[PDB]
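Notes to self after the Tuesday call (sharing in case useful).
The group wants a holo model before anyone commits to mutagenesis around the pocket. I volunteered. Ligand is iron/sulfur cluster. Logging inputs and output together so the record is complete.
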Amino acid sequence: QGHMYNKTVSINLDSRCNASCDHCCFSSSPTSTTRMEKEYIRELVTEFAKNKTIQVISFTGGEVFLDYKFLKELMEIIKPYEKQITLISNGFWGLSKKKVQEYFHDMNSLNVIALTISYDEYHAPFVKSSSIKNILEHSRKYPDIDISLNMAVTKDKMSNHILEELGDSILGVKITKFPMISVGAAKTRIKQENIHKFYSLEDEDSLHCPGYDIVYHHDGEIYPCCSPAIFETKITLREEYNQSFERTVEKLNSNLLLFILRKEGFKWFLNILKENNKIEEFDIPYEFSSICGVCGSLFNSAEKINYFYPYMEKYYNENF
Amino acid sequence: MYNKTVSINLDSRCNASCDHCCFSSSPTSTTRMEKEYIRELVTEFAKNKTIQVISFTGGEVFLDYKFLKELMEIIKPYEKQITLISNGFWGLSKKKVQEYFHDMNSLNVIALTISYDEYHAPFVKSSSIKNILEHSRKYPDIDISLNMAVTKDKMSNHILEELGDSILGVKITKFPMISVGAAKTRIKQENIHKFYSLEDEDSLHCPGYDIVYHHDGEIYPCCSPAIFETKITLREEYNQSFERTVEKLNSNLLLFILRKEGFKWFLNILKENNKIEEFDIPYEFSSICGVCGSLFNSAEKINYFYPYMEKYYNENF
Ligand SMILES: Nc1ncnc2c1ncn2[C@@H]1O[C@H](CSCC[C@H](N)C(=O)O)[C@@H](O)[C@H]1O
Ligand SMILES: Nc1ncnc2c1ncn2[C@@H]1O[C@H](CSCC[C@H](N)C(=O)O)[C@@H](O)[C@H]1O
Ligand code: SF4
Ligand code: SF4
Ligand code: SF4
Ligand code: SF4
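Result:
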């Protein structure tokens, strides 16, 4: 009956990227300076590799293959401990058939179980279609590596032609088209009318958090999930510079707000706001692109989080 | 090993008559296990302590929804997880869609795969698929996938574009045809993508075993369309327990050699004996399973390997 959320961890290596996507939740670019120091990352990876509960370590950015020597070094620290690795990339490195062969050999040797390639109309000005095809076609030689294609779309950029132009390189590839979260470059460079809004406050029984997944982010913070929407809230997991993963897990499992959110869903909070006529005061959007859209507006201020304190206190007293 | 999941193929009858169908399913297909026998199998899998997931397939499982719901209700007190695969014909009615999603959510259905492509399109309307995909947003605990069977002449590019934003958040997988069932005779072999060949011994390994109690009354070691035309059965008698099925899978010599040595062990025997042409092994194929089908689709072909498997067992262990 122990702690949860300690089987996986993600590390965001850098905000620097070869691309400058108009939707990028991190506003990544070749001149982005936000990152944890390399030695600090080596210490985190070493701890995650030695950790008794972590099975999967995931890397993200930014573009993790941009400084491949560093990525390979981190994968090599993990190797003797035999933990599984997941990578996500824009596939710019697909331009070189030599880098494609070499990187797939490294990933297969370093227990990389999944590689996600992001490609769509927002990525297209920075990466050639043929680079994506080279990666997808070569991955057929590495069946143990699960390959996914993630396409970020809007009403004006649905990536219909992009997919058709990839031809048969996508056969056997898990494709997922998803809507934008209005965060980072998407807030200012994309018209809110082009972002799909599928969910509404009327879908109260369907409003449930997709799940917690710890992220040691490139801004030096630790977040409870991988959603772009979490950065705008006041829900963090870091209390000091030298923090162990055991402490990170302990803080997450003992967070009362995150416990009630998991057990009761967003309806518990929304129903308190409706009964107290504070939905408009809290600026809760009627419609949203994802469940995380409510999360942002419910907890984007210390006062909003503090509003729920007497109700959370009452809930703990009643059920504990 | 291989005892955490099980699949049951409820019927070969289907509302559709897809030109690629590995079972050649149609509304006039008569092949199926009896209903009472299926009730007994489901009851046994529900009571089994090791099985976590029970999957249903056909045919079209929603065609006789009353029987599907009855089977899901037998499992319910035992709290096993269920997976369903469907052509989504039932998507025509939004009211029907809400009802089935409510049942699915109450009956621990963790995954629903919808099959849609140019082969399915003459039998199911695009708007039916959209209704299912859009309503699934209300059930985040049900994992939704879209499986599209394609050829060089039917890549389902328009099909996907016509689904619009209903596919947002849906795992889409386009895959090539296995030359089995209706695809063998109704599709030109030049339109089936051939990614693999006998030369690349790498990637000539079985993806893995998954027990299926099929609509022909046999038991298969995997869910691949290719296996249903082989003579590899795990059934020895009418009333056979899942423990016996697992025991037979774990002690099957041909499947042990296939798992450890890969398809190269069998192909090298045929090449060495100049029987590749005699056995009709395709030089090029869409998937690894394409070799499996041609290696073992007759008792004569399977029996050929027996003295070699006997030699292998004597040499090893
Ligand atoms: N505002 C936003 N809303 C939704 N997804 C976004 C987003 N900003 C970025 N993403 C997606 O988040 C993923 C990780 S971004 C960092 C990894 C890498 N450079 C890449 O592009 O894969 C990508 O699939 C990207 O398209
Ligand atoms: N010859 C073949 N090659 C490859 N996939 C095939 C096939 N025959 C059938 N399939 C696929 O196998 C899956 C299960 S068929 C039975 C389930 C249901 N009627 C359906 O269509 O989903 C479907 O996705 C179908 O497209
Ligand atoms: S979405 Fe990925 S590739 Fe595009 S700018 Fe952001 S980090 Fe770079
Ligand atoms: S609902 Fe909130 S905590 Fe859950 S994934 Fe979305 S942003 Fe993160
Ligand atoms: S592929 Fe599925 S929907 Fe099409 S005929 Fe076969 S069983 Fe029926
Ligand atoms: S058809 Fe053969 S190779 Fe394919 S999954 Fe079944 S047993 Fe494995």
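Two things stood out.
Chain A is about 35% helix and 15% strand.
Chain A touches chain B at residues 140-141, 143, 153, 155, 158, 160, 163-164, 168, 170-179, 196, 198-199, 203, 205-206, 208, 210, 291 (CB under 8 Å).
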